[PDB]
RNA sequence: GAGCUAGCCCUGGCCAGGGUGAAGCUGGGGUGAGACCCAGUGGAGGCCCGAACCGGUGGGGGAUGCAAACCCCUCGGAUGA
RNA sequence: GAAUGCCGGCAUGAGUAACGAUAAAGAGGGUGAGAAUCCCUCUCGCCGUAAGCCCAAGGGUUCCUACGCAAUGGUCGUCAGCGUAGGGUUAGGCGGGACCUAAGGUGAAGCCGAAAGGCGUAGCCGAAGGGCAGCCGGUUAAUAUUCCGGCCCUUCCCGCAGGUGCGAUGGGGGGACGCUCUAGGCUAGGGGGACCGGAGCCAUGGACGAGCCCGGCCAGAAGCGCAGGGUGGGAGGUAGGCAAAUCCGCCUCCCAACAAGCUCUGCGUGGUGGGGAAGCCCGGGUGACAACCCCCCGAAGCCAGGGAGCCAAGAAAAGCCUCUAAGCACAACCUGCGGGAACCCGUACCGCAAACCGACACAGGUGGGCGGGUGCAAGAGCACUCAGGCGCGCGGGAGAACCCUCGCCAAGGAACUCUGCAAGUUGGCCCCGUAACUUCGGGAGAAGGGGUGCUCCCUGGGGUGAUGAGCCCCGGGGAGCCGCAGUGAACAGGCUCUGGCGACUGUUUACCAAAAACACAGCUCUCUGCGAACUCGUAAGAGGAGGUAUAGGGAGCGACGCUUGCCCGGUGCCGGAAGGUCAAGGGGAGGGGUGCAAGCCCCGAACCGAAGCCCCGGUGAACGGCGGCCGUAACUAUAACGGUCCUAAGGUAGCGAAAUUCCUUGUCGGGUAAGUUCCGACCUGCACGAAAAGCGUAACGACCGGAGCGCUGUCUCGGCGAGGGACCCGGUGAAAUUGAACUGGCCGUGAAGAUGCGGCCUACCCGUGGCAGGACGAAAAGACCCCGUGGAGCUUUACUGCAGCC
RNA sequence: CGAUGUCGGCUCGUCGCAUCCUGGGGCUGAAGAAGGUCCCAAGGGUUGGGCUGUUCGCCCAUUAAAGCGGCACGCGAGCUG
RNA sequence: UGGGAGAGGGUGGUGGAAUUCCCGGAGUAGCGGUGAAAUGCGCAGAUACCGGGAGGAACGCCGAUGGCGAAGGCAGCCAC
RNA sequence: CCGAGGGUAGGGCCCGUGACUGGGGCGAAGUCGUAACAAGGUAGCUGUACCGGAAGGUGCGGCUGGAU
RNA sequence: GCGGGGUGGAGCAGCCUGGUAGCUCGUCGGGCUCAUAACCCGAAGGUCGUCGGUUCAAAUCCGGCCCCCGCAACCA
């Protein structure tokens, strides 16, 4: 339930912040954090390869456990639910009965102090992690491996999910957060339930400064530059696009599909995305 | 106002220094050239 | 050639003193329970006034200058992008 | 002899401007060949959150002393950051290295690239971050946490004793963390003392006083005391911490918990060791057996890794502790004590500046710490002032114009002007009081007003102390005194009404534009299923992101409210396995060259044959576009209505002479005595219109218009005054410019604007202060304009290529 | 074109006369008063405001009158911008 | 106190029929629509037919002149 | 001291008037259509929504004051 | 200054490419209806802005003229 403010400044008029109700622990597990190198959008050549980046809050990266076949059959208790500044979702702290501690992303409804588990024999229950072939049809599911033993790739952002439509051979049919129908291998692990923090998209950043805190630097329209800079540059006074609207690098940016036509995974997509 | 020369001995030596020149093809050519011309110092003097 | 300047990275430092009084919390009233109201406590903010510091709005001086951009009087921000 | 030639020399302007902050000087005495300028003394003025003091950077002998004054110093110089010489910088504890890691750099492995080279794990390097043992005083002309004195501490080696399963580059803990606000207790620092110590002083009318003036401390091991930080103890199981593990993690049981105990810091005390003023006498000596105490204010610093709240969620690695592994347990490690050992580099001086960066001893720039007192509500603000440091390296006169900076002004009060430009006014605090409108926050310091000093009397509350005295911080009431005036000096909003643009705080053309531009939260379209798209790269490799569609790229629009109409014929994009066209290649009807021939060689039609293109559809918050003529109503006028031509479809809502309106100062209304501007309406909108968004919008603005109140030297209309210049004298002494010059006016003439030619007129020679009409004055080989088959930036359905993609 | 600064304003004037006013005349469809038209005449005078960058022009309130032109659309080594 | 009827309300669950669309099959010259047509859809293989899949919405028969509620109104079935 | 009232400033209510603008009422013989009364030739009314020269039309749900 | 246009009463074809003036509405006569409109059956009306030329022949092709709408008028 997103939190509002009274309009005691201009910016507080519409600023909203998360309610943080699900959070039960406020500093990270020291043995599970490691320093996050901020890149400023610069690659190893020193060159900005992603414009408009940098200057946000310092962060510690929290090591998340996207493979859970690492510990099949060993149940864990849910020790805490904690704020992760590297992802939109909240992460859960797990104490396995082994004593090993680990981080997962916390699905919706996950209760601090409950048992979760992974493996082909796990109960169909929010937090458990089976290979896709053992999850029943019609189940909402998250943190889905794309390929077996490669890592949870799909449905990781706040509130997102994937639903199992049917099985077809060594393969199941997933409807992704995007609406596409894909064939993912049945031996790919997933996690029953949808990712938590579904209110995350109702946040109103509220003012320019809040975007600077998140590492977002101001983004200048092409239409505001000079021809040496952007297809939309120049013009006496304002100006319509005066050509098919284009990126800084020339290519059209309203409708031009950019997926590679001959990509091997095309044999595994049943329908492109909705909407 | 703030002019353009703000001396710094570490910056002077890590930029124009002897070892900075030897590490690079163009740098070795500077030394070869200043040596062939007969320069007394091949490299800025900085007191370290 | 980035010892000027523009951006980013890492690590440190700086921001006198006043002002306003958000949420919450405590109590009181209210109701079937509530919303909600009031008082206190509280100390929020690209909040208000103003040094340092950062600026450069208006005018005047300077114009073989004190200065290849300066001086004076005014003025902007000053917990923040 | 000419090239705005080149190099050098010397002229002109000229004894001219200038001599670098308007903080400020005067006298006496020294020294010396020579003194406004050096030294000393007295008087005066200036800085005092500095114009004082201490670090760092950078500079590199500039430091101290003696002897010098040719050049340097904007003058002088006997002086100096100058010349010559001699001297001077001392560390186990400060800083850095023999320690650790950050970005980044480098890089055994490995990957890539014609060559050069580019990447890259661990590792290594890399600091103003971590870690780590010295405080006070004295001494030199010049160094001092470095020498000396006192009291302390660290590491390494060896030895002795006691204890112990010892042992690491390996496991674990810890190191280890943000922003705002903040408790308790301290210290630093400061104010007072009728208490203690002090050379003295009594003036000029009074004062021998509970008088004036001066001072009243620093450091310190163990122990102890006050305040804090850190920390659970035992046991059983154990499958995780990439071998092991008694450590660590997880499970269960007992006991202990706002404690206590152990541990570690800060403060106080502490054996001792220091220091110690005015004033007088020549840096010193005395003062002096100096005294060294009480109360109060009190940190932003200390305890510290403290507490709370919040979201944007806040380094690493070593030192250190623990666990064990090989190994070894005659060893090794831990504790205590002793003797020995302890290296390299920096250390002078300047350091908001005359020694650094600006060609200069340059009104500019330069990071950190200390920064005292009184008063003004507070403070680092402001005035004065301590300690300390200075009067700015040309002076002496004079008392014009004129310029600058400043003060005042009769009556009027914006009449000035493009514009109240500028300068007035207002101004702090306390209380009274405060409108439209609003998104209910605001608008608001709205507006407007009243108070403000001194004295005596009564009195309420807090802090410390003790509950009292004293001190200290908030106040309340009554009666009075004085002046023109009580935030009596200095620092410190003029206000209101109304439009346009932009929501707002923000950002911008360093050095003519700060805005209405850029950004912005927010809205929409579109791409992207992850070895993502996209971007940089020949590549490997990176960024994206150790992210995963509530995510990331691109594009437009730009808070918010109410909204965003019609056109898919053209262009773009999306979809479309048909058909049409289509390169290499396949195919090989049919020819040709040659040879005696087998054969070798070349041409080659039908037909099969991708993408792209046509062809069929979709698509506007994609590129974009959204008509013309004619007629019609029972006064007139005007047409709801009709007719016809064209379109892909003919502009919807809402706005409108507008940042858009040409005709235009449109017409009417308001404001004014008067209104090409302004505000409100009208609508034949030259040429508004809906995300190059349409119409509004409280709040905000060093934006741009219009009005009014206040107040004024802006003005009628100027006057007087101040200081710094200008002027005169002594010293030092430029500049651009310059064909040569013995360089007048008129009317003509002339390459059409004449000091220089003609005619007339006028004028004795040479300067000084002034003014700017001319010398088509100076400056800059016109930016405008053209010319050149000159150049460069930019665009596209110009040509032709290329990367990239298919 | 190896530069002749370009509107207007301010300041400061100076000249011409095709005379706005003031002085002198003739004619009048001049009764007086006040006008009209032409002649002579350049000595002096020729206001303050609203609007607009404006020159000009309109408007307010006066006036004896509110003249028209030249001087590089007089005058930026005199100012403004 | 003991009992009864009920589409009374709220939550969660779930059952078949149908329409649309998508993929496979088989199949060809029209489908659709109307007063009649036309637009439209269809040899780029539609309509009609079978099998599979996705998704949303509404509950046929019972059903009544019926029942419940204060009204607005409440209908597959199941539990609370 | 209080004190008629005077003066500066800011509010509230009423009244009059105002370029222009909105619908309303009325007016012997105006222009356009034909919405309603018959099933008024699409049954009518209705709350709301959007649209359109105009009456109106259409969507959603409601009423019989609906005919056969 | 560059461009397009002028033809029955209204709005438009024919002009390029010489010989043939056409379409919708309107107007006139009749029909239907009680009557009007709509509707049905028929008819008239254009010497093609103008003067001049080319030609056997000019709406048509070429000139001058009148007109009626447009696009433009920039560097100072
Ligand atoms: K030009
Ligand atoms: K010229
Ligand atoms: Mg809010
Ligand atoms: Mg939460
Ligand atoms: Mg760590
Ligand atoms: Mg990264
Ligand atoms: Mg590089
Ligand atoms: Mg980018
Ligand atoms: Mg970037
Ligand atoms: Mg999170
Ligand atoms: Mg995420
Ligand atoms: Mg798969
Ligand atoms: Mg969002
Ligand atoms: Mg961030
Ligand atoms: Mg932008
Ligand atoms: Mg632009
Ligand atoms: Mg631009
Ligand atoms: Mg560029
Ligand atoms: Mg371009
Ligand atoms: Mg463009
Ligand atoms: Mg532009
Ligand atoms: Mg532009
Ligand atoms: Mg434009
Ligand atoms: Mg556009
Ligand atoms: Mg255009
Ligand atoms: Mg265009
Ligand atoms: Mg383009
Ligand atoms: Mg591309
Ligand atoms: Mg897809
Ligand atoms: Mg600078
Ligand atoms: Mg620098
Ligand atoms: Mg350095
Ligand atoms: Mg350094
Ligand atoms: Mg450096
Ligand atoms: Mg640097
Ligand atoms: Mg380098
Ligand atoms: Mg080097
Ligand atoms: Mg070499
Ligand atoms: Mg040299
Ligand atoms: Mg040599
Ligand atoms: Mg070199
Ligand atoms: Mg630097
Ligand atoms: Mg501050
Ligand atoms: Mg206040
Ligand atoms: Mg309060
Ligand atoms: Mg609280
Ligand atoms: Mg602020
Ligand atoms: Mg402010
Ligand atoms: Mg204030
Ligand atoms: Mg300035
Ligand atoms: Mg001013
Ligand atoms: Mg200059
Ligand atoms: Mg200045
Ligand atoms: Mg000032
Ligand atoms: Mg200010
Ligand atoms: Mg401020
Ligand atoms: Mg402040
Ligand atoms: Mg010659
Ligand atoms: Mg030359
Ligand atoms: Mg020369
Ligand atoms: Mg020479
Ligand atoms: Mg010579
Ligand atoms: Mg010479
Ligand atoms: Mg000479
Ligand atoms: Mg001379
Ligand atoms: Mg001279
Ligand atoms: Mg002179
Ligand atoms: Mg000079
Ligand atoms: Mg000077
Ligand atoms: Mg000064
Ligand atoms: Mg001064
Ligand atoms: Mg002063
Ligand atoms: Mg004297
Ligand atoms: Mg001498
Ligand atoms: Mg002297
Ligand atoms: Mg002398
Ligand atoms: Mg002096
Ligand atoms: Mg002296
Ligand atoms: Mg002071
Ligand atoms: Mg000074
Ligand atoms: Mg130097
Ligand atoms: Mg000398
Ligand atoms: Mg001498
Ligand atoms: Mg000598
Ligand atoms: Mg000299
Ligand atoms: Mg000298
Ligand atoms: Mg000098
Ligand atoms: Mg001398
Ligand atoms: Mg020395
Ligand atoms: Mg020592
Ligand atoms: Mg050694
Ligand atoms: Mg190291
Ligand atoms: Mg390398
Ligand atoms: Mg090489
Ligand atoms: Mg190499
Ligand atoms: Mg290095
Ligand atoms: Mg190192
Ligand atoms: Mg260090
Ligand atoms: Mg040390
Ligand atoms: Mg010590
Ligand atoms: Mg000392
Ligand atoms: Mg051990
Ligand atoms: Mg170890
Ligand atoms: Mg930690
Ligand atoms: Mg941490
Ligand atoms: Mg740190
Ligand atoms: Mg915060
Ligand atoms: Mg102390
Ligand atoms: Mg004090
Ligand atoms: Mg287990
Ligand atoms: Mg003694
Ligand atoms: Mg501080
Ligand atoms: Mg602390
Ligand atoms: Mg804490
Ligand atoms: Mg690291
Ligand atoms: Mg062994
Ligand atoms: Mg042994
Ligand atoms: Mg031991
Ligand atoms: Mg050594
Ligand atoms: Mg030293
Ligand atoms: Mg110093
Ligand atoms: Mg300074
Ligand atoms: Mg400093
Ligand atoms: Mg100094
Ligand atoms: Mg000095
Ligand atoms: Mg120097
Ligand atoms: Mg300079
Ligand atoms: Mg000086
Ligand atoms: Mg200086
Ligand atoms: Mg003091
Ligand atoms: Mg104060
Ligand atoms: Mg000094
Ligand atoms: Mg004089
Ligand atoms: Mg005064
Ligand atoms: Mg006056
Ligand atoms: Mg006035
Ligand atoms: Mg007045
Ligand atoms: Mg005015
Ligand atoms: Mg202006
Ligand atoms: Mg002003
Ligand atoms: Mg009002
Ligand atoms: Mg108002
Ligand atoms: Mg309000
Ligand atoms: Mg107030
Ligand atoms: Mg007030
Ligand atoms: Mg206001
Ligand atoms: Mg009073
Ligand atoms: Mg007094
Ligand atoms: Mg003041
Ligand atoms: Mg103020
Ligand atoms: Mg306007
Ligand atoms: Mg703005
Ligand atoms: Mg706007
Ligand atoms: Mg806006
Ligand atoms: Mg904005
Ligand atoms: Mg701000
Ligand atoms: Mg600029
Ligand atoms: Mg510029
Ligand atoms: Mg510049
Ligand atoms: Mg520049
Ligand atoms: Mg400027
Ligand atoms: Mg600008
Ligand atoms: Mg500004
Ligand atoms: Mg918006
Ligand atoms: Mg590239
Ligand atoms: Mg590439
Ligand atoms: Mg990564
Ligand atoms: Mg923008
Ligand atoms: Mg639109
Ligand atoms: Mg279209
Ligand atoms: Mg189309
Ligand atoms: Mg299209
Ligand atoms: Mg053959
Ligand atoms: Mg093809
Ligand atoms: Mg178009
Ligand atoms: Mg267009
Ligand atoms: Mg009529
Ligand atoms: Mg509309
Ligand atoms: Mg208009
Ligand atoms: Mg107007
Ligand atoms: Mg407008
Ligand atoms: Mg405009
Ligand atoms: Mg317009
Ligand atoms: Mg015009
Ligand atoms: Mg106009
Ligand atoms: Mg005009
Ligand atoms: Mg007018
Ligand atoms: Mg009109
Ligand atoms: Mg507004
Ligand atoms: Mg507003
Ligand atoms: Mg602003
Ligand atoms: Mg502004
Ligand atoms: Mg104004
Ligand atoms: Mg005004
Ligand atoms: Mg004056
Ligand atoms: Mg004077
Ligand atoms: Mg004289
Ligand atoms: Mg000299
Ligand atoms: Mg010269
Ligand atoms: Mg001569
Ligand atoms: Mg002469
Ligand atoms: Mg003469
Ligand atoms: Mg001539
Ligand atoms: Mg002449
Ligand atoms: Mg002559
Ligand atoms: Mg001559
Ligand atoms: Mg002659
Ligand atoms: Mg002559
Ligand atoms: Mg002559
Ligand atoms: Mg004469
Ligand atoms: Mg003169
Ligand atoms: Mg002159
Ligand atoms: Mg002049
Ligand atoms: Mg001249
Ligand atoms: Mg001149
Ligand atoms: Mg040249
Ligand atoms: Mg030239
Ligand atoms: Mg030229
Ligand atoms: Mg030039
Ligand atoms: Mg030209
Ligand atoms: Mg050519
Ligand atoms: Mg040529
Ligand atoms: Mg060319
Ligand atoms: Mg260029
Ligand atoms: Mg070129
Ligand atoms: Mg010249
Ligand atoms: Mg010139
Ligand atoms: Mg004037
Ligand atoms: Mg007369
Ligand atoms: Mg007569
Ligand atoms: Mg008469
Ligand atoms: Mg006259
Ligand atoms: Mg005018
Ligand atoms: Mg003119
Ligand atoms: Mg005019
Ligand atoms: Mg008269
Ligand atoms: Mg004139
Ligand atoms: Mg001229
Ligand atoms: Mg001139
Ligand atoms: Mg002229
Ligand atoms: Mg000028
Ligand atoms: Mg001028
Ligand atoms: Mg002029
Ligand atoms: Mg001149
Ligand atoms: Mg201008
Ligand atoms: Mg200006
Ligand atoms: Mg067909
Ligand atoms: Mg076929
Ligand atoms: Mg769907
Ligand atoms: Mg009274
Ligand atoms: Mg009275
Ligand atoms: Mg009254
Ligand atoms: Mg009807
Ligand atoms: Mg009907
Ligand atoms: Mg009908
Ligand atoms: Mg009807
Ligand atoms: Mg309709
Ligand atoms: Mg006609
Ligand atoms: Mg036609
Ligand atoms: Mg034709
Ligand atoms: Mg023909
Ligand atoms: Mg009839
Ligand atoms: Mg003819
Ligand atoms: Mg003929
Ligand atoms: Mg041009
Ligand atoms: Mg011009």
UniProtKB/Swiss-Prot annotation, chain A:
Do you know which InterPro entries this protein is assigned to? NA-bd_OB-fold, Rib_uL2_dom2, Ribosomal_uL2, Ribosomal_uL2_bac/org-type, Ribosomal_uL2_C, Ribosomal_uL2_CS, Ribosomal_uL2_dom3, Ribosomal_uL2_RNA-bd_dom
Report biased composition (Basic residues) as residue ranges: 256-275
- Signal peptide range in chain numbering: none
Q: Name the Gene3D superfamilies for this protein.
A: 2.30.30.30, Nucleic acid-binding proteins, Ribosomal protein L2, domain 3
Which keywords label this protein? Ribonucleoprotein, Ribosomal protein, RNA-binding, rRNA-binding
Task: State where composition is biased (Basic and acidic residues).
Answer: 229-239
GO-annotated molecular function? rRNA binding; structural constituent of ribosome; transferase activity
Q: Which GO terms describe its cellular component?
A: large ribosomal subunit
- List every stretch annotated Disordered: 222-275
Membership in a protein family: Belongs to the universal ribosomal protein uL2 family.
**What HAMAP family does the entry give?**
Ribosomal_uL2_B (MF_01320_B)
Q: Which NCBIfam families match?
A: rplB_bact
Role this protein plays: One of the primary rRNA binding proteins. Required for association of the 30S and 50S subunits to form the 70S ribosome, for tRNA binding and peptide bond formation. It has been suggested to have peptidyltransferase activity; this is somewhat controversial. Makes several contacts with the 16S rRNA in the 70S ribosome.
Instruction: Quote the subunit structure annotation.
Output: Part of the 50S ribosomal subunit. Forms a bridge to the 30S subunit in the 70S ribosome.
What name does UniProt use for this protein?
Large ribosomal subunit protein uL2
This chain's source organism reads Thermus thermophilus (strain ATCC BAA-163 / DSM 7039 / HB27)
From Swiss-Prot, chain B:
**Which Gene Ontology terms of cellular component type are present?**
ribonucleoprotein complex; ribosome
- In this chain, composition skew of type Basic residues spans 29-48
Which PANTHER family does the annotation name? LARGE RIBOSOMAL SUBUNIT PROTEIN BL34M, MITOCHONDRIAL RIBOSOMAL PROTEIN 34 FAMILY MEMBER
Q: Which InterPro entries match?
A: Ribosomal_bL34, Ribosomal_bL34_CS
Q: Which UniProt keywords apply?
A: Ribonucleoprotein, Ribosomal protein
* Name of the gene: rpmH
Its family?
A: Belongs to the bacterial ribosomal protein bL34 family.
Reading the lineage from the top rank, the first entry is: Bacteria
User: What the protein does?
Assistant: Found on the solvent side of the large subunit.
Q: Name one Pfam family in it.
A: Ribosomal_L34
Miscellaneous comment text of the record: The open reading frame (ORF) for this protein is entirely within the ORF for the RNase P protein (RnaP). The two start codons are separated by four nucleotides.
Biological process according to GO = translation
Region of interest (Disordered), residue spans: 26-48
Any one Gene Ontology molecular-function term assigned to this protein's record: structural constituent of ribosome
> Assembly state and interactors?
Part of the 50S ribosomal subunit.
- Put simply, this protein is called Large ribosomal subunit protein bL34
Q: Which residues form the signal peptide?
A: none
